[PDB]
Symmetry: C2
């Protein structure tokens, strides 16, 4: 077997908080989405943040990559830091957007793929857990 | 959409130089120089894939350090996603188990080497991740 879906996700950081979106009916995920053939990962992410949030984001440092399996398919998530953007994030894809202290992730319903690597996420934000 | 193939590659350094390997004689990229690494297998993390690949290609036991860069290649309807990791620490000295030949080069000389067409197009990003230019 050998099937894979590459995904980009943004860590939008502001005032010590991180932006998280509630999946449509709800788990809380980092905004972003799938990489389309022909796009760089940074292009994909700028596009998805524009599509989901309506912002024009500067894609910053590549922080982390993780793999997870959904049985028949492999998922590869690339996590990029976003420190600068134009526009305000609006919930045009998610039922709810929320700024949270990274600490809250420990007690929010996030995808099990994100929960299993939460230690890596905090390290990737330069935080201790 | 098409299909995606995730790939890992490692930056190993020697007194400023960087390790490249020349693809073997009946290879799809026979004669061309690349960073060591290979495909991620199902179930494994990119770091697990890279440590395995480095042992199988170089005969070394390496620790996988910081993720430095991710790049995409398109070959028609197939996409390649390459993750480049810094490799600071390993046991042993790389030997040509897979490649025709190994060489430690000055990273700035990468552009003058016979490198894969796809690798050339991402060279500016590789320089930036290596701390050059
Ligand atoms: Cl997510
Ligand atoms: Ho999207
Ligand atoms: Ho390999």
């Amino acid at each position: 077997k050998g099937h894979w879906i590459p995904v980009v996700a943004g860590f939008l950081r502001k005032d010590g908080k991180i932006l998280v979106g509630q999946r449509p009916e709800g788990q809380w995920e980092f905004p972003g989405g799938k990489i389309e053939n022909g796009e760089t990962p940074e292009e994909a992410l700028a596009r998805e943040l524009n599509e989901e949030l309506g912002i024009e984001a500067e894609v910053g440092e590549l922080k982390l990559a993780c793999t997870h399996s959904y049985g028949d398919v492999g998922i590869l998530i690339l996590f990029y830091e976003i420190l600068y953007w134009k526009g305000e994030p609006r919930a045009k894809h998610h039922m709810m957007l929320e700024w949270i202290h990274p600490e809250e992730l420990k007690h929010r319903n996030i995808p099990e793929a994100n929960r299993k690597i939460l230690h890596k996420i905090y390290k990737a934000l330069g935080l201790e857990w």
